[PDB]
């Protein structure tokens, strides 16, 4: 049903304990506060589906949402693509509009409504903070800045179709008391970011009002770009190879179908099947899987205007001899080769990602998370250099 | 004889024109100013011999030195390895002693004895400065910061043998009016850097006084570590290959000798020659050059405690078959392989560099300069994307 104790809170919400369910044992509650919760519930669900570790479970009512319990980091991370207001005042000379390409990440010391300054990434490390048991140093500070930039880009991309420019945003992290992971732990409403109208060009430039932002955010959870990956295999004995591609495609939310066809045996049939994927208007990418001399990829590519990846099921036995039938093609063939089965699915994702922000986001989160993972393995092996 | 007009000047020297010799048409003149000139004359000659582009020609008298004429950049570049004084005051929290590893580079706006603030690398670009025709932007600002760090490390290394720790330094650049290159254009005396005694440990930590620094700086121009590269070739028909290595070694100031010996023909003789390089105490690195089945490298490595590089003179005719005789050696052989002739000389340099700061410096300057070159080619091809 619902319970609750006391606990902490921020400026927009009040965090409460939740007996009858420990861990995610947290409830955020807080006119227009219901708008602020609708926004923060989408951005979170969005960033979460993309792959970003974020403190959010399910939406709750109109002005609430439960999320895992965690100790907050007293720092305000801000990311910019364009310099405006405050920044200008702090950085004399930078004319408004200056675009930052990496883009710029700055963090502000303790949120304290007093002066709450700007800390150097080095003053945070020397701060030697520790929450939920996690001592915050190089590794952790590096994760948050990287994750902030990643979260920025994801939202920046997600907004573009609504014709909105993410100028800059503010975000706070927190260590999950259970998993001990640094997570995007606190609400993101219309005062967490700044969205130009981007159809330097419009009025004096006015951030979208929480009202307009409100009735658009749910649209970021869906994409206009449809996409499909069709896997063609010359022989069912490679079914396993094709399934790794299919499963991989599943990780990037891209629908994928497996099919059996032989350029060598049923030339005519291969073209036929090609036609029914071409004629139905769904943007498609073909992945050709043919062992030995691969004539499947070459033929497909030569008869379709869509991309064609040859992903040969090589084994070290004769692999070195077979790949060349996939590389070395007669002129006029765009056909590309990718040896890794999941790798080919990833490439396909990156192809569709150019049009589907939801896919792009998953690629981006993944890039980040892989870095997070690298970072941790090094710290774990570093322990053993004593 | 000598002439001169008016021109500009800094805080320690007064730059004068020099009729009878345009371009390098500059003279720096300025008790203890003679000390300041002796110091700045070595550091310059040092950085110059290492490969750093620096505004310095020859020393002149006791309190002067001529250098090429150039327009100065109104910025003070500072590099730190350890945080102290000023920095601490500017960065609250960073306890004294904090080591910066990249290490830290900061630049201060216009030298103006007024407030002469701290500029962001982005405020300098937006400053849109232009000297001697060179508009200063991304590329140029990036060169100076990189060059500053490189110059730091070189001097940091150069000092170590005198048991001195380079804590931080200040440096100013300038565009050479002739070549148009950004060069380390202005004096480096004892007020340009800070040298601990490094034998947190000594007194309250006192920078060396210009007197002690003075009678040590000339020692940085020489090294304690002797080094020699001996090139063994199984056949004089590879003489050309060996000479590229020799010439390359010449670029890193390492003496190199070529010799003829055959593991297959004169086994006994090869060992003999090996012995006369081992017995004379000069730290040596052996580079084995043997075509076809290379038994020279393998044998050398197995009979000497010094390093042995196999640098096969491969050609695409049978290269793919020959390299394996240099790779794939029976156990107990440290023998390493390096295909590029100059590349093998470079590796040898990096080996000796671990002990000869003069060599290390040349390696470092080279790393930098290659980056400078990459940077410029991209900017030159970028022009053609209009």
Curated annotation (Swiss-Prot), chains A, B:
Pathway: Purine metabolism; IMP biosynthesis via de novo pathway; 5-amino-1-(5-phospho-D-ribosyl)imidazole-4-carboxamide from 5-amino-1-(5-phospho-D-ribosyl)imidazole-4-carboxylate: step 1/2; Purine metabolism; IMP biosynthesis via de novo pathway; 5-amino-1-(5-phospho-D-ribosyl)imidazole-4-carboxylate from 5-amino-1-(5-phospho-D-ribosyl)imidazole (carboxylase route): step 1/1
SUPFAM superfamilies recorded: N5-CAIR mutase (phosphoribosylaminoimidazole carboxylase, PurE), SAICAR synthase-like
Gene3D superfamilies, alphabetized: 3.40.50.1970, ATP-grasp fold, B domain (3.30.470.20), Phosphorylase Kinase, domain 1 (3.30.200.20)
Residues where CO2 binds: 293
Keywords: Acetylation, ATP-binding, Decarboxylase, Disease variant, Ligase, Lyase, Multifunctional enzyme, Nucleotide-binding, Phosphoprotein, Purine biosynthesis
Species name: Homo sapiens
Residues covered by region (SAICAR synthetase domain): 1-221
Impact after mutating residue 32 to R: In PAICSD; uncertain significance; no effect on protein abundance; decreased phosphoribosylaminoimidazole carboxylase activity; decreased phosphoribosylaminoimidazolesuccinocarboxamide synthase activity
Listed GO MF terms: ATP binding; cadherin binding; identical protein binding; phosphoribosylaminoimidazole carboxylase activity; phosphoribosylaminoimidazolesuccinocarboxamide synthase activity
InterPro entries with a match to the protein in the record: PurE_classII (IPR033626), PurE_dom (IPR000031), SAICAR_synt/ADE2_N (IPR028923), SAICAR_synthetase (IPR050089), SAICAR_synthetase_CS (IPR018236)
Name of the protein: Bifunctional phosphoribosylaminoimidazole carboxylase/phosphoribosylaminoimidazole succinocarboxamide synthetase
